[PDB]
Amino acid sequence: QYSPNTQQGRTSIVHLFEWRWVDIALECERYLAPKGFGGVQVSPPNENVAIYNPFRPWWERYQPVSYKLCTRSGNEDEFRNMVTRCNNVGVRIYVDAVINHMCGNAVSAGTSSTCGSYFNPGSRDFPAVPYSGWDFNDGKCKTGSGDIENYNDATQVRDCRLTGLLDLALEKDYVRSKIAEYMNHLIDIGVAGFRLDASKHMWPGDIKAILDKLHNLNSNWFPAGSKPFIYQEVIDLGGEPIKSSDYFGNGRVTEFKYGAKLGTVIRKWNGEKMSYLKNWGEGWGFVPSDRALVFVDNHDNQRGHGAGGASILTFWDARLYKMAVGFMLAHPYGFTRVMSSYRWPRQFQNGNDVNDWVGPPNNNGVIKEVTINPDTTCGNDWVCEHRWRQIRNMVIFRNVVDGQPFTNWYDNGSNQVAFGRGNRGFIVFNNDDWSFSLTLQTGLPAGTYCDVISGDKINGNCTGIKIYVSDDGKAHFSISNSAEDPFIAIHAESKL
Numbered sequence: 001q002y003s004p005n006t007q008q009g010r011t012s013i014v015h016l017f018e019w020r021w022v023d024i025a026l027e028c029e030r031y032l033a034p035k036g037f038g039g040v041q042v043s044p045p046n047e048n049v050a051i052y053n054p055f056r057p058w059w060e061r062y063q064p065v066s067y068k069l070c071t072r073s074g075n076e077d078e079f080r081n082m083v084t085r086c087n088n089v090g091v092r093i094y095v096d097a098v099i100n101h102m103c104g105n106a107v108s109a110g111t112s113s114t115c116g117s118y119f120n121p122g123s124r125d126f127p128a129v130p131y132s133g134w135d136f137n138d139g140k141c142k143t144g145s146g147d148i149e150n151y152n153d154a155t156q157v158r159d160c161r162l163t164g165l166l167d168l169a170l171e172k173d174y175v176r177s178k179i180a181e182y183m184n185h186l187i188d189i190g191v192a193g194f195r196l197d198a199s200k201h202m203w204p205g206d207i208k209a210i211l212d213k214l215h216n217l218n219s220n221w222f223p224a225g226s227k228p229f230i231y232q233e234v235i236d237l238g239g240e241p242i243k244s245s246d247y248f249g250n251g252r253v254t255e256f257k258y259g260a261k262l263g264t265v266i267r268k269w270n271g272e273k274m275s276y277l278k279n280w281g282e283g284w285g286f287v288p289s290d291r292a293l294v295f296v297d298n299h300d301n302q303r304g305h306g307a308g309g310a311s312i313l314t315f316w317d318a319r320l321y322k323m324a325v326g327f328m329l330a331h332p333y334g335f336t337r338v339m340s341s342y343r344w345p346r347q348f349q350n351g352n353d354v355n356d357w358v359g360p361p362n363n364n365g366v367i368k369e370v371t372i373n374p375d376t377t378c379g380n381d382w383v384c385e386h387r388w389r390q391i392r393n394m395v396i397f398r399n400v401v402d403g404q405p406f407t408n409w410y411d412n413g414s415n416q417v418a419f420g421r422g423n424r425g426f427i428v429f430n431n432d433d434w435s436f437s438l439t440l441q442t443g444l445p446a447g448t449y450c451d452v453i454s455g456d457k458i459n460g461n462c463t464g465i466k467i468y469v470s471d472d473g474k475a476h477f478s479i480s481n482s483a484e485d486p487f488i489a490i491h492a493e494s495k496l
């Protein structure tokens with residue numbers, strides 16, 4: 001469960017948030033495969049409630065109506081087509097599994113669903129599954145509202161409704177089986193793993209029981225005995241009885257402390273600075289590296305909607321963001337996931353974004369295709385961070401140095417730091433208000449290297465900064481605090 005099952009040598013997955021299956025299929029073949037991306041986290045592929053007030057918000061996909069693979073991203077055939085094409089070029093598919101609940105208990109009954117399936121939240125009926133009142137936690141939940149009211153009580157957190165979302169009775173074999181039927185279908189079709197949505201809201205033992213029902217990965221694309229990759233969403237910042245470590249027996253866990261702290265250090269909040277990153281990882285109270293699914297931001301907290309506070313860096317903070325993503329992709333801690341977003345009319349009032357509900361780019365509710373501009377960026381308001389040179393090249397950097405140890409660390413006691421990965425890569429950052437010019441021990445073989453942040457290695461030459469490593473492994477680096485990208489990265493494959 002702990003291994004991502006990526007093709008040998010690919011170390012990251014990208015969240016193609018709200019992308020349609022056809023666009024992802026094309027992206028796997030045209031970009032993800034040749035660029036060394038390990039896989040794609042897709043938005044919930046199962047039928048959800050079609051919410052028109054507000055107009056088709058992104059969060060309506062976390063309110064299940066049935067397990068039919070029929071959503072705004074595409075139908076069942078378009079989904080399989082995507083998984084097949086991606087696997088065929090060595091790019092995996094990870095499904096965002098919303099199995100803790102169905103839709104909000106107050107949503108009106110009817111067929112306002114992405115596949116037209118009828119459902120009645122009030123009578124607890126979801127015939128397409130089918131689920132009835134017997135399959136929810138109404139009787140089990142102990143709170144006066146029926147919703148989660150206090151996180152200091154690990155029981156209600158698991159048995160009561162998360163913000164009114166109908167809570168499935170995951171202890172019942174019937175429910176566990178309907179969920180496993182949905183997940184095994186996806187596995188046999190070729191999916192490599194799953195993001196278990198709202199895991200903090202499910203008992204570690206219930207998740208385990210469902211996982212016991214899961215098959216090994218498709219034997220035509222994967223080695224015999226391959227278990228699906230499992231990363232459970234648990235936002236554990238340390239002040240609750242529930243700890244993300246309680247879920248290690250099922251797989252990895254999202255380490256939300258990662259982006260929260262990387263955000264405060266890079267934003268230099270509360271006197272924090274990059275020199276403190278020397279012992280980044282478990283030293284910061286994070287889960288063990290082999291149980292961590294890391295990221296700078298995720299679909300929820302990039303709109304302040306999730307957890308990490310206002311410290312979370314996003315594409316809106318492009319400059320600091322690329323640097324945050326760069327440090328993450330260079331550091332050996334955890335399995336990395338890069339975010340890929342769409343732009344929305346962010347509108348702050350009294351400090352809160354009133355348009356944080358806005359769904360993906362669309363025409364009358366129909367999600368827009370991802371258009372690729374000549375410079376390889378995306379149109380139709382898709383940000384495509386995974387396509388930014390500075391990020392895509394660090395995804396490659398991670399592949400190149402995989403297995404190499406963290407060493408040759410340096411810091412000026414402030415915000416100018418650097419470190420290497422064995423003898424295959426070196427990265428330097430300058431987040432101080434003054435220039436950084438110094439000769440550093442890179443641990444790399446002598447030669448000329450292309451800086452992959454400011455440029456690329458192309459046809460035997462560099463399009464950007466060039467770094468010269470001497471026989472003693474030393475190299476001079478110069479980074480202005482006013483540079484477009486205040487960090488430089490070189491590796492075994494960017495060497496001339």
Ligand SMILES: *[C@@H]1O[C@H](CO)[C@@H](O)[C@H](O)[C@H]1NC(C)=O
Nearest residue numbers: 457458459460461462463496
């Ligand atoms: C690298 O580019 C220069 C021109 O900028 C050219 O003179 C040189 O031959 C190129 N080398 C290779 C190996 O393509």
Ligand SMILES: [Ca+2]
Nearest residue numbers: 158167201202
């Ligand atoms: Ca629950």
Ligand SMILES: [Cl-]
Nearest residue numbers: 195233254298
């Ligand atoms: Cl997540």
Ligand code: NA
Nearest residue numbers: 005006007008
């Ligand atoms: Na493998």
Ligand code: NA
Nearest residue numbers: 197198233300
């Ligand atoms: Na969540």
Ligand code: NA
Nearest residue numbers: 001225226227
């Ligand atoms: Na196993």
